[PDB]
Symmetry: C2
């Protein structure tokens, strides 16, 4: 699925217009991105948590340190996917 498919599902679920649904989807992921870029934790009860984690440089090949925007799924999501 893609963003436009998500938008269509949101519209169908809420009966909001596709136009409002699209603005809402874009605002959600813009907001998560911005909070992560500010180095905040994003906790979404019933879904999971986004947080930037540091990955150390590794060592012929050398990988530099990185800041990885990472996701930890909640139990509700892990359960649904596994079943």
């Amino acid at each position: 699925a893609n963003k436009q498919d998500l938008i269509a599902k949101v519209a169908e679920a809420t009966e909001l217009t596709k136009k409002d649904s699209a603005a809402a989807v874009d605002a959600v992921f813009s907001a998560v991105s911005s909070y992560l870029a500010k180095g905040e934790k994003v906790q979404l009860i019933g879904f999971g948590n986004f947080e930037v984690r540091e990955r150390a440089a590794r060592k012929e090949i050398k990988i530099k340190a990185s800041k990885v925007p990472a996701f930890k799924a909640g139990k509700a999501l892990k359960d649904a996917v596994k079943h």
Copy 2:
């Protein structure tokens, strides 16, 4: 930041009332969960991809079956935003 903060961002960014914004945010994450539960990837350009990955099977000898788990792979825009 948490779900309530995202809802505030949605209402601020969109035409939507606070109650409609909350419905919209919940519908977004319910939709993502519904796709992953079905085993379908969710690709969001300019944010990242939600995927379903294998958990390794492991080891009277006994085998714990391989499982499916949710995963997130940040996109280039998000990674650059964080770094």
